[PDB]
Design a binder for this molecule. Structure first.
Ligand SMILES: Nc1ncnc2c1ncn2[C@@H]1O[C@H](COP(=O)(O)OP(=O)(O)OP(O)(O)=S)[C@@H](O)[C@H]1O
Ligand SMILES: Nc1ncnc2c1ncn2[C@@H]1O[C@H](COP(=O)(O)OP(=O)(O)OP(O)(O)=S)[C@@H](O)[C@H]1O
Ligand SMILES: [Mg+2]
Ligand SMILES: [Mg+2]
Lengths: 256, 318, 325, 44, 255
């Protein structure tokens, strides 16, 4: 029960590229108001949630909810075959056993259809608890990715401190240390590079380098990343989209 | 939540608080005061205060530079050939400015679990960079460290803590913790410690937490070992039927394995004084024969019964 | 359903752990207070250590127990490397959690090596703040003093009859079974503080019944299902040695051993246990009997010819009990 | 080292390249270095 | 205390990249006039001598002389952490155990400071004396780089024949031989592409191919390369900078 039609095909390619490294199995839940998906890695440190609304559909028909498990390695391999001219169409029957990926052009009769077998891991746990965050900040995805790949070389743990009207990234390692402090600004030419920060309470907590590199590979989805920080709570790193958002729930580290 | 154990809450933060091995501790204090710390291998039984001595010496030697001048590698951390060839060598080659005489300290705690090749690779590392860094090992068994490593260090063989030092520090802890003590209870704590100071502190803490006033009976309730008085009565009874009944009821039916019974009997007999030295040694020989038979595989109840019968013969006769 | 009675009748809470009462009371005081130090449950197998820790972990950790508790077993194909890997990954992750004190249940730690035990001690010391260990073992003499000093030891004793009989009554009425008093006494005295053995023997006795609805289980059924010497057989051998001719005693001993499949070690132990109940006029009788039978058992363990060992048993008993007469 | 000190007469003159066990003494890690050291002259 | 401010952060990155592959451990001895670096090869064959003048920094204090021993791998790693518009600042305290690299910007947005732990290195002052090199040839860096890059695949040893004011590169092998010959000349349209020679005595020396390939990694700081060969002295491959020079001291083989 799914008639998913995408106006652009490569956007879903960046969507799965964001999913790729973090987790290898997601059981998608397709509903009448769009497609949602949530998964947790094997180490139970990183939680990925995907929200896709009807706004990113030329036409959508999902009258009955459908559970869709699909290998992201196989989907990535087959989605690399999608041209920039063809458009994606997802079709699922009653109790699907193989999801069909369909491509159609506009000026030439070129049809590309593919079949993907599903999984039956029987895991559909969806848990969301944190709806408030002490610190909310946004910055370009390229900038945050640059900072994290800059500080991951020195240490396996990167601190994100939020001191009064300033952002501070600290990473102390064997070969040395590194402190990248940035201050919010409003670029009058365009807000695409502006740094916005909301300050309620000071925030001081450390994360993992490998996990942070796992989140920042979703920078292809959107040019802006929203970071929500709060003490003794899962951090949030969202990538805004036209119909929804792709946010990551990450577990901090204990220093004692 | 949790309460800090008296093992950790009353851990010596200075070298003077550490009791036992007065000569070695005084010489370590002098080294920490002056400097030029030699390579050392502190070895001995568990619980006598080896790791505490190493950490206190490192702290007193360095001061504020302890964080960036000491690298600790326990068994939980990796200490393979790659670790020795890269991390330890880079730490030795690191340029840290310290007060004159002071040197960086490479604390390799539990060096008896280290592989032989890592020890061989450590030898050239300590021989080359000895002008900037000094190594400090801490092993339970000193024979597990290769002779090339032992030929470049001053081997320290810490001895078992005597009853006097354990009693002194226990009295200190009881005095700062407001603990009701009795002579028999403290004697029981020393007896169950057997030179393991950590065991003495843990037993005192358990007795205080559970049964309040530290009596000998209270101490012998939290040791989960055969009661020394019960075992002494079993061994020294003039009626063999009573000894057999005691062994069947208070030891075998209560779940005490043959090894624990033999160990308690040996310890009690060694501490026995009313019997003659020859009788003591012969009963010890019987206990050794029974322990041997248990180690071979025959650890049944009949072996312990025969041990009791032989001890009864030895006591009543001869 | 089609499951063994061992898992079906597991203690789902701390109130169903019979026999051991000091440990359960201390554990309940621990959870009520909130102080849960590192625990070491050790003792004879089947005493209820794993049941106790599982019940406590469920009681504290509600529904999150699946993710907040990792149950290890050092006897598996992991070794020091993978075991350490799993412990540090579970203890240092600090996953999204409702509270803390992730619990690690390391079963069969007496098979862990000395270096592995020292490494486990170090890991316990490092991650005490967020992870609590309840290392499990069966023998305390196979554990290094380093691991023994970082955990609150809780010895488990073999269950007392008052408990074993209570669990007998509980299982019997629910499974609709009848145990004759002699058969129940035989099972209680044959378990030797092993509830798992009780459950296995009970299930086998259920399967043995032609009509497992109202057929009462007899003494012989249990004594042949468990594979143990009947008291009657050992008593007959003992009385044949004590009051009959050498040839008749040898015939009775060989016949009983062959017909019941009984080794000489079990015969010696049963004879000693039976003779303990009886009183002897002299003391040299008991001394010589115990010493000679222990020597015979030790020689049997090493090896030899069984005929001479049986003759030695008969002669030792006869000489010892002619000393008293 | 003492023989080198006596032969050269100075500590700085002699250049002894010690291949100890603290490094990786494998062919693909030291053959080129040792061949270059034993083939050309040290800069002095 | 050291406070050296670069006009462009890429300058120090290029300077480090010029010799970051041949040597691993380098002494950054700093004095009043500027920064002088000296790292010997791990094979004890080639010596990299670098000098940076005061006029290469926007600001340069250097109150007292200080030696900054550093590992080239970690230093190159921390240097790659920045943009061309950044103003790299080298900060070191008195008797430092760590060197601070402050990556500022023209507008103060991302002020990022990176610290690098120092290393204990035995400093060996090996400045050359007054030497009368028999040959002195200078050609564009791109030329020499191309010749040795394409001609090192023919043989492991490279012979730069110079005789009668003629430059010839020789590397003979069993499969074949490769020879490239260029003559000195002066071009008014582009003097930087000209060839010069101030030969005094004939010399014919042969050095390793790998080490010349390592040397030409410095063909990114200067348009030309200065070569001074001597029959009984180590060669000097100098790359003249706007304020100093990056000279490579290649040593001769055993006779
Ligand atoms: N002589 C002593 N004086 C005071 N406290 C002591 C002494 N010996 C041991 N302790 C205490 O008992 C504990 C011993 O800790 P450690 O020194 O780490 O044990 P160890 O001697 O290294 O032996 P291990 O750990 O089995 S290898 C600490 O809590 C000390 O405070
Ligand atoms: N005190 C007890 N109260 C109730 N049931 C018990 C008790 N002790 C054992 N059992 C039962 O007997 C079996 C013992 O299970 P476990 O506790 O897993 O064994 P264990 O005591 O941990 O010893 P092992 O052999 O080392 S796993 C289970 O079926 C329990 O239900
Ligand atoms: Mg220690
Ligand atoms: Mg178990």
């Amino acid at each position: 029960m799914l008639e998913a039609k995408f106006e652009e095909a490569s956007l879903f390619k960046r969507i799965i590229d964001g999913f790729k490294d973090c987790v290898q199995l997601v059981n998608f839940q397709c509903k009448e108001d769009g497609i949602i998906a949530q998964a947790v890695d094997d180490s139970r440190v990183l939680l990925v949630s995907l929200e896709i609304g009807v706004e990113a559909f030329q036409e959508y028909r999902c009258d009955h909810p459908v559970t869709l498990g699909m290998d992201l390695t196989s989907l990535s391999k087959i989605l690399r075959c999608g041209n920039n001219t063809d458009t994606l169409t997802l079709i699922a029957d009653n109790t699907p056993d193989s999801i069909i990926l369909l491509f159609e052009d506009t000026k030439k009769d070129r049809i590309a259809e593919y079949s993907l077998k599903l999984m039956d891991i029987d895991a559909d746990f969806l848990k969301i608890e944190e709806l408030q965050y002490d610190s909310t900040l946004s910055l370009p995805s390229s900038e945050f990715s640059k900072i994290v790949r800059d500080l991951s070389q020195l240490s396996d743990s990167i601190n994100i401190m939020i001191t009064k009207e300033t952002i501070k990234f600290v990473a102390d390692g064997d070969i040395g240390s590194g402190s990248v402090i940035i201050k919010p600004f409003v670029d009058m030419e365009h807000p695409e590079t502006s740094i916005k920060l909301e300050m309620d309470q000071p925030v001081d907590l450390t994360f993992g380098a490998k996990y942070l590199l796992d989140i920042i590979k979703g920078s292809s989805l959107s040019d802006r990343v929203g970071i929500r920080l709060s003490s003794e709570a899962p951090a949030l790193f969202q990538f805004d989209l036209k119909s929804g958002f792709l946010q990551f729930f990450l577990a901090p580290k204990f220093n004692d | 939540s949790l309460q800090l154990p008296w093992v950790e809450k009353y851990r010596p933060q200075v070298l003077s608080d550490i009791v036992g091995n007065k000569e070695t501790i005084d010489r370590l204090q002098q080294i920490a005061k002056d400097g030029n710390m030699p390579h050392m291998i502190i070895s001995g039984m568990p619980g006598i205060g080896k790791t505490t001595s190493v950490h206190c010496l490192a702290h007193e030697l360095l001061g504020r530079s302890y964080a960036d001048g000491v690298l600790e590698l326990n068994a939980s951390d990796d200490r393979g050939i790659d670790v020795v060839r890269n991390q330890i060598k880079h730490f030795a080659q690191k340029k840290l400015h310290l007060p004159p005489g002071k040197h960086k300290i490479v604390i390799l705690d539990e060096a008896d679990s280290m592989t032989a090749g890592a020890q061989q690779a450590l030898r050239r590392t300590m021989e080359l960079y000895s002008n900037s860094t000094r190594f400090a090992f801490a092993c339970n068994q000193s024979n597990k460290i290769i002779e090339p490593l032992q030929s470049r260090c001053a081997i320290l063989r810490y001895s078992k803590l005597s009853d006097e030092d354990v009693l002194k520090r226990l009295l200190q802890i009881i005095k700062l913790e407001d603990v009701k003590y009795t002579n028999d209870g403290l004697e029981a704590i020393i007896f169950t410690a057997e030179g393991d100071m950590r065991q003495a502190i843990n037993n005192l803490q358990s007795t205080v937490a559970g049964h309040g006033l530290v009596n000998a009976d209270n101490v012998f309730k939290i040791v989960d070992s055969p009661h020394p008085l019960i075992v002494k009565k079993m061994l020294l009874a003039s009626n063999l039927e009573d000894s057999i009944q005691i062994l069947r009821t208070d030891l075998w039916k209560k779940g005490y394995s043959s090894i624990d019974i033999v160990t308690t009997s040996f310890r009690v007999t060694k501490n026995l004084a009313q019997v003659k030295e020859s009788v003591r040694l012969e009963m010890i020989k019987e206990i050794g024969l029974t322990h041997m038979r248990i180690l071979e595989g025959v650890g049944t109840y009949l072996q312990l019964a025969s041990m009791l019968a032989k001890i009864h013969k030895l006591n009543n006769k001869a | 359903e089609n499951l063994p009675w061992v898992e079906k009748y597991r203690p789902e809470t701390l109130d169903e752990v019979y026999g051991q009462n000091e440990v359960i009371t201390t554990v309940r005081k621990f959870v009520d207070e909130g102080k849960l130090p590192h625990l070491l449950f050790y003792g004879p197998p089947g005493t209820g250590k794993t049941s106790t820790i599982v019940a406590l972990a469920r009681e504290i950790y509600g529904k999150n127990y699946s993710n907040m508790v990792l149950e290890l077993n050092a006897s598996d194909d992991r070794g020091i490397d993978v075991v350490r890997n799993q412990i540090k990954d579970f203890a240092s992750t600090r996953q999204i959690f409702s509270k803390g004190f992730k619990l690690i249940i390391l079963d069969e730690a007496d098979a862990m090596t000395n270096a592995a035990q020292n490494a486990l001690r170090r890991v316990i010391e490092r991650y005490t703040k967020n992870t609590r260990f309840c290392v499990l073992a069966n023998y305390a003499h196979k554990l290094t003093p380093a691991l023994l000093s970082r955990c609150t030891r809780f010895r488990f004793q073999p269950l007392p009859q008052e408990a074993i009989e209570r669990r007998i009554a509980n299982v019997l009425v629910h499974e609709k079974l009848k145990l004759s008093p002699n058969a129940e006494k035989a099972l209680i005295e044959l378990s030797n503080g092993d509830m798992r053995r009780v459950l296995n023997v009970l299930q086998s006795c259920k399967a043995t019944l032609d009509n497992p609805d109202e057929d009462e289980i007899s003494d012989d059924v249990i004594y042949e299902c468990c594979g143990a010497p009947r008291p009657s057989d050992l008593k007959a051998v003992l009385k044949s040695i004590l009051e009959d001719d050498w040839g008749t005693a040898h015939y009775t001993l060989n016949k009983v051993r062959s017909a019941k499949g009984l080794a000489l070690i079990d015969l010696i132990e049963g004879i000693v246990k039976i003779l303990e109940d009886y009183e002897l006029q002299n003391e040299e009788t008991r001394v010589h009997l115990l010493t000679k039978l222990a020597d015979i058992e030790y020689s049997i363990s090493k090896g030899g010819n069984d005929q001479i060992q049986g003759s030695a048993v008969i002669g030792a008993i006869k000489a010892s009990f002619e000393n008293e007469t | 080292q003492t023989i080198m000190r006596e032969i050269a007469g100075d500590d700085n003159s002699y250049q002894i390249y010690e291949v100890n066990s603290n490094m990786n003494r494998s062919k693909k890690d030291l053959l080129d270095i040792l061949l270059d050291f034993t083939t050309t002259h040290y800069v002095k």
